[PDB]
């Protein structure tokens, strides 16, 4: 049941990334605390957001409710293992202990991993470790648990749950700058309709496109977005980035820049991207310019400055620092405003890699085969 707790993770990100109205973080943390016993939101807001303007006792009462809850959980721990349970005593205690403080976590994972017995004992354990990680912007939890899973969960698994583990892997692959294996693991589209792991299938589409407009080269672009009309029956609900992708074939750079600003702000205000979203947009820029110049040579940026908006000075500094970033072999001027189609690998590079590696590894093995004697 991590979808609402994924929304709570987004609450924590709102507490983290936007410090505009810290009461809004206090707002939804108190809203998640007044019911569902969720006190961890309340300590979380106490720390980063406001210091709980009025929640000294209004949430300490529900903290005492969580205290009685945890104490009766740990009492039924012995009341039920009094009876025989096929690791199901510890299974129930780990499930119910995955609400209040990290007390619930330490009575959750210290009582499952020791007697995790079958696929489900770790199926839910790894799903909910992914959730306890995703509440913050974690990667140790949400993939170390996948390591345990590889040791524990699947072993054949389901045609349903294993696709879910793979979609977890892809969900972090888009959370991190792993701009391909997300869409690879999000290539299912027949096994992630709706789940307690899918906070929103439309948000599934968001994470998917925010890795597919990069992983999917033009053939894979049309393969998954266009051809794969399975996601289209659902991405019919978010036409902004969809039409962006539509232009992403005809290469309409004006609307490219419109939606580029749009998605830039969007990522600026979206989870698990705050300290990294910098490249994606300028990467889209350079990649599109690549094909645009690849059209032909005797062309101008000014002829494209229209598509660039008023992009003469914009792209001046832009492509200056981009070629300075060592990108996109091409030619362009100011007094001449050139465009180019160049950089064939089978000119020298397809022959330069030869020594690039047969000297790197050559001397690697050389010194490696030097200390064999000296």
């Amino acid at each position: 049941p991590k979808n609402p707790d994924l929304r709570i993770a987004q609450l924590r990100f709102l507490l983290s990334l936007p410090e505009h109205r810290g009461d809004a973080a206090v707002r939804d943390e108190l809203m998640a605390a007044v019911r569902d016993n969720n006190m961890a939101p309340y300590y979380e807001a106490l720390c980063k957001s406001l210091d709980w303007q009025i929640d000294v006792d209004l949430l300490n009462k529900m903290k005492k409710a969580n205290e009685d809850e945890l104490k009766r959980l740990d009492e039924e721990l012995e009341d039920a293992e009094k009876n025989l349970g096929e690791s199901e005593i510890r299974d129930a205690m780990m499930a119910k202990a995955e609400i209040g403080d990290k007390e619930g976590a330490l009575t959750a994972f210290r009582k499952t991993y020791d007697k995790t017995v079958a696929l489900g004992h770790r199926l839910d354990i790894v799903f909910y470790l992914l959730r306890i990680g995703l509440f913050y912007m974690d990667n140790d939890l949400i993939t170390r648990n996948t390591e345990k899973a590889k040791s524990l969960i699947e072993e054949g698994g389901d045609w349903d749950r294993r696709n879910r583990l793979k979609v977890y892997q892809g969900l972090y692959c888009v959370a991190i700058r792993d701009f391909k294996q997300a869409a690879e693991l999000f290539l299912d589209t027949v096994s992630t309709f709706t789940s307690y792991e899918l906070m929103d299938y439309k948000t599934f589409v968001t994470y998917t496109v925010y890795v597919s407009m990069i992983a999917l080269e033009r053939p894979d672009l049309r393969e998954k977005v266009i051809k794969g009309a399975e996601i289209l029956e659902v991405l019919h609900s978010l036409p902004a980035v969809r039409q962006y992708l539509f232009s992403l074939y005809e290469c309409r750079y004006s609307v490219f820049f419109q939606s580029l600003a749009v998605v830039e702000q969007e990522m600026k205000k979206d989870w698990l991207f705050a300290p990294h979203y910098r490249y994606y947009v300028r990467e889209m820029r350079i990649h599109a310019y690549s094909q645009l110049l690849e059209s032909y040579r005797s062309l101008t940026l000014g002829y494209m400055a229209e598509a660039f908006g008023v992009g003469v000075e914009f792209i001046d500094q832009e492509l200056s620092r981009f070629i300075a970033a060592g990108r996109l072999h091409c030619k362009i001027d100011k007094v001449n405003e050139i465009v180019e189609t160049n950089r064939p690998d089978s000119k020298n590079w397809q022959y330069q890699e030869t020594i690039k590696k047969g000297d790197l590894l050559l001397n690697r093995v050389q010194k490696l085969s030097r200390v064999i004697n000296m």
Binding site: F193, E230, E233, V234, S237
Partner: protein
Amino acid sequence: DMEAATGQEVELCLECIEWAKSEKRTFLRQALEARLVSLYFDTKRYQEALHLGSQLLRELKKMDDKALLVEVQLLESKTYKARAALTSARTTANA
């Protein structure tokens, strides 16, 4: 079928649904639910058209009737997986 007067259409429909909560006629409330979800598609409502189709089809294949089940499976195939929902409407339609 007079005019797109959206101020009273969906509200009057929810009213006698609440009357059907208070009177409990099965065939009359199903008559009201089927047009309401058709009215939801007329403005193409995003989730609640699907959520009304979910909450009614928890009971429709559970209850005894067969004939209107074919329509509400078919109405979901417009709002949608749509190949899957159409084929389930295919095998129901033959009886």
